[PDB]
Amino acid sequence: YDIQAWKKQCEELLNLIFQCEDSEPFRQPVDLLEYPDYRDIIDTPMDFATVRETLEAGNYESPMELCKDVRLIFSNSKAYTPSKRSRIYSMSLRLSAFFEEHISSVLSDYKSALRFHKR
Numbered sequence: 001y002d003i004q005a006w007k008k009q010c011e012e013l014l015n016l017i018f019q020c021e022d023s024e025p026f027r028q029p030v031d032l033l034e035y036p037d038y039r040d041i042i043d044t045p046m047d048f049a050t051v052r053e054t055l056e057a058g059n060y061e062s063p064m065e066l067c068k069d070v071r072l073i074f075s076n077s078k079a080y081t082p083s084k085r086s087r088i089y090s091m092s093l094r095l096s097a098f099f100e101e102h103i104s105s106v107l108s109d110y111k112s113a114l115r116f117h118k119r
């Protein structure tokens, strides 16, 4: 019932994501020189370094907020992809499945801890 445990759990999960080859296109903001029309389609860029920095700055209040920003990385890749078969989009799908598989217990434990706190 540790209400703060999610933060280190998210740091460790981000470490695993940064080790995944599939995260390379998503570690830093999308390069506008390589994809000049990016901001015409994507309103809110997001990347894993921004997520990690936000977490480390103490600017997430809950793992739900972190999860919303990670999911935005994946929805931006889906919105920008020219094809559902593209290389970068396929990497995003594998990374999303890995992230969802690991974030589920983090969210469950946090929500359970809050409910215990307010019992």
Ligand SMILES: O=C(O)c1ccc(Cl)c(Cl)c1
Pocket (backbone or CB within 6 Å): 030, 035, 076, 077, 078, 080, 081, 082, 083, 086, 087, 088, 089, 092
């Ligand atoms: O060229 C592509 O397939 C491509 C380039 C950049 C992104 Cl973010 C995505 Cl999802 C796809």
